[PDB]
RNA sequence: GAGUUUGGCGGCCAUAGCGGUAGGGCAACUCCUGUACCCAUCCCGAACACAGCAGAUAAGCCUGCCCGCGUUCCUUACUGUACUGAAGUGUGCGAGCCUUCGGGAACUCUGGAUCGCUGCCAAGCUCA
RNA sequence: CCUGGGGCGGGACGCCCUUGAAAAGAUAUCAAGGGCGCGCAAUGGUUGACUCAAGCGGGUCGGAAACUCGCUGAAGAGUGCAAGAGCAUAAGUCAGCCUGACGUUAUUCAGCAUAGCAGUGGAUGACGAGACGAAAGUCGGCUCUAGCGAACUUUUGAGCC
RNA sequence: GGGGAUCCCUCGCUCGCUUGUCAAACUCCAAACCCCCCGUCAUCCUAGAAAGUCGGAGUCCGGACUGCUGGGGUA
């Protein structure tokens, strides 16, 4: 709302409303690589980055869309294809080289058991070094999909297939 | 102001945070066996005692809150650099 | 009477231009200096910690060490050398 | 996907004093909602009403889905289905002033209760007006996309069909 | 009082009244003249002082009052306009013993004038020049600087 | 392998803002549908969160355009003006001001542009 | 003691901010504006969630004096108290949990432009313990700069000589 | 909100578009000097740079000219 010349318009990201400088401060005082979580909603994204002055530089990146070659046909946006992610990113990221960096949510709620919390067990997981407080992990039971109790009989093999492409992907990635 | 009557802080004897219960220091009696009372009776006589015979000064407006920390658990105390209240009182 | 405190005649030395107010960009506060590097001294008044003495605002700095986050800069005021601990927010590297 | 569709529907009871007429006030509220109410705080105390800062005055509480739109329904039907164009905002919002709640089936007027008044208003929004409400991504709708007068009157008559004079 | 005493610019300004005590109100009451809704007066003259001085809000209104006065004698109640463009701004202060604690009392106030700055301008029509410029050497009189009058607008018209 | 679309993280932090106009979504995003659940409301699944079959580009987002306010840059006049570094047996009754050499505005005006540029990665694609 | 002689008046006699001060630093006067000799277990730390002042329109003797809804609103509020500076997904407001308003210790500032007191800033140091938080971090009080005192003496704390 | 029962009508401030003026303690702008650092030329420097250590002091009544419209002051 630019009034005249007194006026201070903020930062792009921020008038776009898509990063919290303070934290982005807060995380990269840590001189860590960030694994920047964000999720849509139909699917869920992790990258690893590190600051240039010119700019942020991704090492590594996952999304839900590759989970359909190891085997998965359930939906991309939830806890399944968050933990799916995870795993693939932190096991991908193992296999080029970096193997530490501390979690970055941005703007997004930290609510225990969510899809970046279990995106977060993913990536821990596939044994990329990450710290963490166990609490705000998800339950096993709906990390292998126990929410297709609720109103899907089509979901019912959500646990089978979980495991099915958890074992592609070890395979794949070990 | 108030400050509460126990609360959790870092003992320095035993290394660690302990509750510990805040207690108002009071000045003691000097001792008539010090060695300034000694030099003391020494030095009076006929005439000026000297710096014996000064008159006490005056009061700072606020005096400092003199506090002292007792560990619940080690039942030692110790006394920090403590701040200048007019008015002060124990929270319970 | 006038004081002797830090910020003596600091008025418009720890200002911010009109349309730099606020959080500064967070670039500036994790950038690296080696040992020798140059760099000058641009306090940024919003960082209130880590913050040298107004009066070497516009002196160039020779890093000579870090301790911390902050950086140890020889810098000349008239005629002898300071020591002067800086955060990166307020640093900047010379260009050459 | 233009239509004005009911944002949420508040009524609010401005006792004006707290205590137990306050107490009566938001027990009869809930009653008529069938939703917590929530007690509304002064914010400058005043002599007139004898009142100090942040001290409890009055009473509101949001409604949202099918229990607004069947609160909406009766407060129409208290006011007749009528509502005037004053009534209404620039942008598509009413609100309307009642006195007895006895006029909501399901409560019984007290001697002592007294019969209080509220205002009822409903916010009329388009659908999609969640991109200034979210957290990540929050811009501000454009002046295109606001409801108007006329479109809030047109939409409360193809939906409740409340005329307004 | 005379006006040689806060004649000379030698100080930095002192306007901002916040920070002082008590100044005395002006003299001055208006500072347009003649016909203030008319602005088709084809001949525009000016009085511009040579001098950098301050001139005292009471020879403001001594000079205002004389070119008025002859502009209203001359060209009518209505065949006229003039603006007096400054306004009194710098405080003048007086030390009133001897020099300890000598930091002066707000005694008056003075707008502070550069060299070629335009203090009255007068606008008439053709025929009323002459009596313009008589009333205007009238009013420069009671200035305390070396006056000038200049021909803003008409000097086709006039000659 | 080069380029485009979209998404993510960003840099400079209005040349990017505020405002107006016309088009798009196959994928992606989004709006959008619910509240078994993890999580939540000083009340409200509004938000957050989770789980998502439709409809929709009307919004967000993207592309094109508009000088309208704001900003930034250029151009002509003001103008080498204001101011100023050095020096001066130049000058004023005085407050001061002048000459030379060297630097050099701001505002306004004439006429223009500016309705962001840009780094990394990923995925869809468009290849010889 | 200072002091446009001294005296009377006053304290420019300690500390902090703006101007004076001439765009690095320094810079005097009984120079101008002034302020401080405190308050606060919350008016503090951290996390989460929110955004303020003031206008415009709607809502009942709830009056143009309340409360509530919608729009505008980079801050025109608030941040304890002078002045200046800083701050908007906050350094503000509310709520959850807390006491880092922690013991010891090294440097350098700029701590007082200082050779030079007490003491302060650090805050990025270190050791040892913690609060909050997924983590990153933040916390050595209150957003930064005032709120204070040598030697000797006594009293108090821990363990020693 | 100032003036002499339908507040029957007169209207100063307040808020904008234009005129006219301002500021030590205002700044959307913004020099010339000046300051730190880098390179360069220039000068000094192994007939000893910068730095360090030690011996001996004097000095803390100053004044003037040219600028800073320096501050204060009628001067």
């Given at each position: 709302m630019a009034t005249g010349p007194r006026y201070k318009?903020?930062?792009?990201?921020?008038?776009?409303?898509?990063?919290?400088?303070?934290?982005?401060?807060?995380?990269?005082?840590?001189?860590?690589?960030?694994?920047?979580?964000?999720?849509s909603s139909r699917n869920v994204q992790i990258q690893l980055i590190a600051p240039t002055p010119d700019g942020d530089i991704t090492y590594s990146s996952a999304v839900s869309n590759e989970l359909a070659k190891y085997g998965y046909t359930g939906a991309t946006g939830n806890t399944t294809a968050a933990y799916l992610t995870g795993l693939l990113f932190g096991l991908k990221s193992l296999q080029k080289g970096y193997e530490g960096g501390i979690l970055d949510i941005g703007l997004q709620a930290s609510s225990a058991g969510s899809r970046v919390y279990a995106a977060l067990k993913g990536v821990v997981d596939s044994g990329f070094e990450i710290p963490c407080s166990p609490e705000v992990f998800p339950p096993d039971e709906r990390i292998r999909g126990e929410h297709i109790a609720g109103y899907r009989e089509e979901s019912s093999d959500l646990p089978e297939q979980f495991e099915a492409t958890k074992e592609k992907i070890f395979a794949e990635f070990s | 102001?108030?400050?509460?009557?126990r609360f959790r802080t870092y003992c320095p004897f035993c290394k660690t945070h302990n509750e510990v219960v805040v207690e108002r220091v009071k000045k003691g009696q000097a001792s008539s066996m010090t060695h300034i009372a000694r030099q003391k009776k020494r030095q009076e006589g006929i005439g000026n005692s000297g710096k014996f015979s000064k008159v006490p000064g005056g009061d700072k407006?606020?005096?400092?809150?003199?506090?002292?920390?007792?560990?619940?658990?080690?039942?030692?105390?110790?006394?920090?650099?403590?701040?200048?209240?007019?008015?002060?009182?124990?929270?319970? | 009477?006038?004081?002797?405190?830090?910020?003596?005649?600091?008025?418009?030395?720890?200002?911010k231009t009109v349309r730099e107010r606020g959080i500064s960009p967070v670039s500036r506060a994790i950038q690296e200096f080696e040992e020798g590097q140059m760099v000058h001294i641009d306090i940024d008044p919003s960082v209130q910690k880590g913050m040298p003495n107004p009066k070497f605002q516009g002196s160039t700095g020779k890093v000579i060490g870090q301790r911390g986050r902050s950086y140890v800069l020889e810098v000349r005021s008239g005629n002898?050398?300071?020591?002067?601990?800086s955060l990166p927010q307020h640093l900047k590297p010379q260009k050459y | 996907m233009r239509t004005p569709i009911v944002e949420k529907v508040i009524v609010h009871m401005g006792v004006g004093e707290s205590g137990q007429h306050l107490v009566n006030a938001e027990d009869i509220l809930r009653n008529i909602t069938g939703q917590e109410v929530v007690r509304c705080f002064a914010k400058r105390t005043l002599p007139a009403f004898s009142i100090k800062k942040n001290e409890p005055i009055?009473?509101?509480?949001?409604?949202?889905?099918?229990?607004?739109?069947?609160?909406?329904?009766?407060?129409?039907?208290?006011?007749?289905?009528?509502?005037?164009?004053?009534?209404?905002?620039?942008?598509?919002?009413?609100?309307?002033?009642?006195?007895?709640?006895?006029?909501?089936?399901?409560?019984?007027?007290?001697?002592?209760?007294?019969?209080?008044?509220?205002?009822?208003?409903?916010?009329?929004?388009?659908?999609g007006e969640r991109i200034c409400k979210r957290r990540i991504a929050a811009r501000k709708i454009p002046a295109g996309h606001r409801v108007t007068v006329d479109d809030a009157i047109a939409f409360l008559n193809e939906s409740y069909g409340v005329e307004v004079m | 009082?005379?006006?040689?005493?806060?004649?000379?610019?030698?100080?930095?300004?002192?306007?901002?009244?916040?920070?002082?005590?008590?100044?005395?109100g002006s003299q001055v009451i208006h500072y347009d003249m003649g016909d203030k809704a008319n602005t088709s007066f084809p001949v525009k003259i000016s009085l511009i002082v040579e001098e950098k001085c301050q001139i005292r809000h009471t020879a403001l209104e001594a000079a205002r009052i004389t070119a008025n006065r002859h502009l209203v004698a001359d060209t009518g109640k209505m065949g006229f306009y003039m603006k007096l463009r400054v306004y009194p701004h710098e405080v003048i202060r007086e030390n009133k013993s001897g020099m300890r604690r000598a930091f002066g009392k707000n005694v008056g106030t003075a707008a502070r004038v550069k060299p070629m700055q335009k203090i009255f301008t007068v606008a008439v029509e053709k025929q009323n020049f002459k009596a313009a410029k008589e009333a205007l050497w009238h009013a420069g009189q009671k200035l305390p600087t070396p006056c000038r009058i200049v021909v803003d607008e008409g000097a086709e018209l006039v000659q």
């Open positions: 318009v903020p930062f792009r990201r921020r008038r776009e409303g898509r990063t919290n400088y303070h934290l982005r401060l807060k995380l990269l005082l840590s001189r860590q690589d960030r694994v920047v979580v964000r999720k | 102001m108030k400050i509460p009557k407006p606020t005096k400092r809150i003199w506090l002292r920390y007792r560990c619940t658990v080690c039942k030692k105390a110790h006394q920090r650099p403590c701040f200048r209240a007019k008015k002060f009182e124990f929270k319970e | 009477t006038n004081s002797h405190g830090e910020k003596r005649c600091t008025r418009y030395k720890l200002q002898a050398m300071k020591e002067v601990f | 009055g009473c509101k509480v949001t409604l949202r889905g099918q229990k607004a739109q069947e609160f909406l329904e009766t407060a129409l039907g208290i006011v007749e289905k009528t509502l005037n164009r004053s009534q209404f905002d620039s942008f598509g919002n009413v609100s309307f002033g009642i006195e007895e709640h006895t006029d909501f089936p399901g409560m019984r007027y007290d001697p002592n209760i007294g019969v209080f008044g509220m205002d009822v208003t409903v916010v009329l929004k388009r659908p | 009082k005379p006006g040689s005493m806060y004649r000379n610019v030698r100080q930095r300004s002192f306007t901002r009244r916040k920070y002082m005590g008590g100044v005395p």
